[PDB]
Design a protein around this nucleic acid. Sequence first.
RNA 1: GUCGCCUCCUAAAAGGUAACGGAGGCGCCCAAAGGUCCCCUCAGGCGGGACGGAAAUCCGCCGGAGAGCGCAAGGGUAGAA
RNA 2: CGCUGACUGGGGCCUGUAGAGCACUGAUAGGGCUAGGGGGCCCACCAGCCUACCAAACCCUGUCAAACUCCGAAGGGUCCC
RNA 3: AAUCCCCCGUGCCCAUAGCGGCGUGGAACCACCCGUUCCCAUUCCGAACACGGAAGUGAAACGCGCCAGCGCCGAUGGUACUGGGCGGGCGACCGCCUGGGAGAGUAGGUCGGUGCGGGGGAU
Lengths: 122, 53, 86, 113, 60, 138, 177
Amino acid sequence: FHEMREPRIEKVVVHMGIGHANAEDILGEITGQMPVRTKAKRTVGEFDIREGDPIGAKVTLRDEMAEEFLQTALPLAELATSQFDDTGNFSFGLDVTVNLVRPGYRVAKRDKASRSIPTKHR
Amino acid sequence: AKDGPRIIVKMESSAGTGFYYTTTKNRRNTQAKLELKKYDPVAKKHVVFREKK
Amino acid sequence: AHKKGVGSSKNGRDSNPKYLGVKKFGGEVVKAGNILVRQRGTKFKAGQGVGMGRDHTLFALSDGKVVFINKGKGARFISIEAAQTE
Amino acid sequence: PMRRRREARTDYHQRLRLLKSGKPRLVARKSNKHVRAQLVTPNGDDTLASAHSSDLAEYGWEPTGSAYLTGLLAGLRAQEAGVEEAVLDIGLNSPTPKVFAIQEGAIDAGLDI
Amino acid sequence: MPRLKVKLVKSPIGYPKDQKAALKALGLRRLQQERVLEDTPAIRGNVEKVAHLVRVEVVE
Amino acid sequence: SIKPTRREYISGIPGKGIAQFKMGNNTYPAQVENVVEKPVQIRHNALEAARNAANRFVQNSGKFRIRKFPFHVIREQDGDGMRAPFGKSVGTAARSHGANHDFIAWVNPDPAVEFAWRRAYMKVTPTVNIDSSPAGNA
Amino acid sequence: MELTAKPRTPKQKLDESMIAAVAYNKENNVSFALDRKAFDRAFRQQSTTGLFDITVEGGETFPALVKAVQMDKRKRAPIHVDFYMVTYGEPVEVSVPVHTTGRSQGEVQGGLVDIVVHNLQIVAPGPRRIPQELVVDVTKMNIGDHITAGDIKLPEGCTLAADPELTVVSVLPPRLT
RNA sequence: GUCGCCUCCUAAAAGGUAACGGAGGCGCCCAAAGGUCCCCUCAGGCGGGACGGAAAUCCGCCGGAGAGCGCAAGGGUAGAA
RNA sequence: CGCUGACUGGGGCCUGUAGAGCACUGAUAGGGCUAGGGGGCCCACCAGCCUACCAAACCCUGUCAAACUCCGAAGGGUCCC
RNA sequence: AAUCCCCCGUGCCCAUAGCGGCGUGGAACCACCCGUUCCCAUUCCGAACACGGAAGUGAAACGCGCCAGCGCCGAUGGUACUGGGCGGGCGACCGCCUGGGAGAGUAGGUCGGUGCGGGGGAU
């Protein structure tokens, strides 16, 4: 069946987030799927005690879109190594990650018979 | 009621005249001179309804 | 002119929950099963409960009344054979 | 959780919502490939294959019409039985334009909804 | 029609409420006396419970 | 069986203060041990102690294991006098349910430890039962 | 060895010289028989640690004996036992003991000792095929060492109805290491 | 010391009972925790990466809901409040 | 008013102590696996190394609970015959 | 059109259907799929919701079967507790007589069982 396991995209994010207005507007222009999420906590490791603020930025981008980005954005990054994490997936840079997509990935999405994703398929 | 100048203040609301009023408890807390809603005075039925008093 | 501490001492007051009409008696459009007032009655008997099965009340009229979760709101009708043609 | 509280997606209970009463569960089961609805009415009721995409073949008019008819007819088949005013059954998804379609059926179908 | 013939013993003096009724019930006036009935689990029951009460005899 | 006010409102959540369980040494078969029959909110302290003095007289190999441990407690004089009695705690233990698996003098041939425990019973309080286990004591 | 009974009489039975004990076997049971006197002797040997059987009407001379029971009662004198045979080649639930010797390492030199939360070994070798007395002791003992499942060392019959790393038997300070 | 009222335990298993017997809450509030119509699937743990080495933010798996619900408890209960 | 009443036989439907139980919770002991603090060693920004003292959490051997209970009777209740 | 095999909508019985290990199915079915002007639509993209349509595929969600490792179910004989009756001990309590009789504990058992309709599959 070698026509299975053999890959076919699957998500792939790329974001950022600072204890804050607009900076994500530089985010909008580079793609088109704005991320609006609220980080938090309550300490002074940066002055981020505020436990309920809007600073988390995350511009989701799988398939289609991500393609234009994987593309016009894959040249300025210089590495290709280690940064290779188990769960077929990896994260480099000012904040970006992308996940593998072996054939036994999805199922882990079902509300039912949620096969805890076997470790021989992924 | 127990008149407590504590964000606890009782008020009503006319019926554009529909004539009289109808019961209501309140709290400056927010929106001060704010208070509107419809009902129906002995006057036919319905009618805008400010609450201020 | 106040009150003290280190005397926990704090009796409790009264309630009055029940199953009134229990299961399978002369059914009268009145307070069905009780253990949560404001209750929202239902249709006939009830069988849903943090237990499993269900309960019939071979008694049928307008409706009864719930208790908020306990017992198990009615809906599984059950007028009773005593609801046919006179 | 209880069987229906660990999976996800359904709303069956938003079915039981109408369960209470109102009429036949003019329930409309969809599967793109086509649309299929029955008529679960209270008391361990049943149904009368009122309208199906196969019953009368699956035509070649896609969504649109399909419904437009499947319903109507459906509605036709039933009001022969002796129903009258039947309650709708969004079976699933949001009264999508399909849905809405079939819907029409009933309505136009003269089976009040 | 197993007919039962019981007698009176150990005065129910001060003994359990009901128990007594089972007394006046089965039909129990004065002391150490004898009465008879049909098996009838009913009547039966009562009496039995009364057990120690006195003595039962299968007669007719 | 009067017991306490709750496991976290009056007095519940402690270490009870004592001297842990195991001592002596292993042993696959030899069943050497001790249990009772008496009922008594086993006198903590008295308890803790006792058992211990047990080690005090032996030292090493003989399952100086011991399956007890108090965990609730009494109360009395503190405040006015005798009437409406609040409560001042002191002295927890555990119910020695009319007999049961006490502590174990468990090991091959080491009665030099049986006598021990023995010395252990002597002590204790509520009489005690001198015994053996599946097989006896070798 | 012998033991009889099986009607319907536990109280008196459960009394005197005869203690209850069901005739348990895969598929069928039969009133409790036995006796409060046999249990003794035999049991005394090593109940579910070896195995035999008794001749009641020559009926079925088979093994398996006890897979449950209890001297329960306070007194510590059993009453109401369980009995199950096995004339099959499936014998699994096999719990037979395992003994060391005394190999000198932490003891006769370090005084140190060792707990053996193990001792026994419920496994399942070659059904109706086990050495009533199996010994294994690679030795070793003292300091903060410990040995358990995992390592072990199983001969012939490759079962292990058990797991790895778990209550084997270590060496602790009978005083201090 | 303490007296009203809300919950637990005490009540021995319908209901319900003293004790100056145990412990703990309330004389608020919310105009939007209001009414419905439409969507959501929790805590947490694990694995991978910005500012981040407790403790986020996203991405991928596991989940009789143990999170969730202004307030004390207790019932509830995501189908969901 | 007149067989309706205490009581018994039958039939449903309930409560869920005693007991028991450890996956909810809070104890708590013997121990294994482990990382937090050690602790001795290259002198120790080394964050590399061994291991006899304290531990958190998971795993085995065990055990206490009125304000715990996946379990569950004695019995009592209530309508009908 | 008033019989069985199959798939599909789907209901009741609240795990003897769950977990997971291997496997099988695509003519039919169903999904994934192919695209995105207009219906509607994402606080970000038509991933999900969504309109139109072949090829491609059974990988995945899925349906039937085999596997007891985790679970879940769970007897008989059995011990506690006890309604009722009566005795011993100053004693905390012990026992007897009669009907009730669990959990855990070994056997073993389960990998659903069954409604109605629709498509076919059996002149």
